[PDB]
Amino acid sequence: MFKDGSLIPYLTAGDPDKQSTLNFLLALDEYAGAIELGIPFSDPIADGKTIQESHYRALKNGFKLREAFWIVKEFRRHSSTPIVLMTYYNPIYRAGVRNFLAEAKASGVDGILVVDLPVFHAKEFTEIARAAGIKTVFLAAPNTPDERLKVIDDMTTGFVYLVSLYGTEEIPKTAYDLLRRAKRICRNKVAVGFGVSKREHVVSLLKEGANGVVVGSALVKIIGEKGREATEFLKKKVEELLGI
């Protein structure tokens, strides 16, 4: 879904508020090959501590599911950068999958990543996304075996998202292994979310085959520190990571 060598910013919708998220996206768009917008959830047990806390902030501040579409829609008035909505299944499942994706497509979403999509629903789900014109993005962690990476790749229409809960401040060997195994199996492009925080991480991961590199923790951490005034620091952080 994105150019090779892309830096993909990740932000939690509504952290600290929807208008700020929009401000952050617009300020970072010029450096993004694509964007992951996360829907805050009460139990983000698959995320790192930094991102989990941003989910809590957004929910405390009063975030509401559809405020995510407002953010995407408004962003779309100024940009066409690919957008991937990241979310836990619960919210989607409870609101009605079919209506959610149609609405997602309507507001401008290009792809969707369901962090904990139940295998039992995978097939039907991908079929529903395709009919809605929404590309699928599947997640794989270091404990994901080759056999599954292949099954994941064949279902993927957007891009395979490789992650590492290990955190760092260096990218763990287990994370490099996942990337190395995935590039040997996936036909789809792969994006990596290994908790980058230093310019050499970006240079290193792209060099090892990552089609794209997500930057979430580093940006969210700044948002938890600066709140609504995080904007400028977000831009500096991204420039540091791009060597510019």
Q: Strands 190-193 and 111-114: what pairing?
A: unpaired
Measuring CA to CA, which residue among 194, 181, 193, 109 is closest to residue 152? 181
Q: Which residues contact 168 (CB under 8 A, 6 or more apart)?
A: 194, 195, 197
Write the single-letter amino acid at 69: F
Q: Does residue 185 contact residue 150 with C-beta atoms inside 8 Å?
A: yes
Q: Is 177 assigned a catalytic role? A: no
Distances (CA, A) of 123 to 118, 152, 229: 10, 11, 42
Q: Does residue 188 contact residue 162 with C-beta atoms inside 8 Å?
A: no
Q: Is 240 assigned a catalytic role? A: no
DSSP state, 117?
-
Residue 159 lies in domain: 1-244
Plot region of 156 (φ>0 → left; ψ -120 to 50 → alpha; else → beta): beta
Resolution for the entry shown, Å: 2.4
Method: X-ray
Write the single-letter amino acid at 114: V
* Structural tokens at position 225: 């520190």
* Structural tokens at position 62: 């009063």
Q: Which residues contact 15 (CB under 8 A, 6 or more apart)?
A: 21, 40, 54, 55, 57, 58, 61, 63, 220, 223, 224
Distances (CA, A) of 171 to 119, 163, 236: 29, 11, 22
Residue 150 is part of a domain; what is its CATH number? 3.20.20.70
| Residue 61 main-chain phi, psi, to 5 deg | -70, 0
Number of domains in the chain: 1
Q: Where are the beta strands (DSSP E) in the chain?
A: 6-12, 35-38, 83-87, 111-114, 135-140, 159-163, 190-193, 212-215
Per the residue annotation, which of 36, 67, 110, 153 is the catalytic one?
Answer: 36
Q: Strands 83-87 and 6-12: what pairing?
A: unpaired
Per the residue annotation, which of 4, 15, 29, 47 is the catalytic one?
Answer: 47
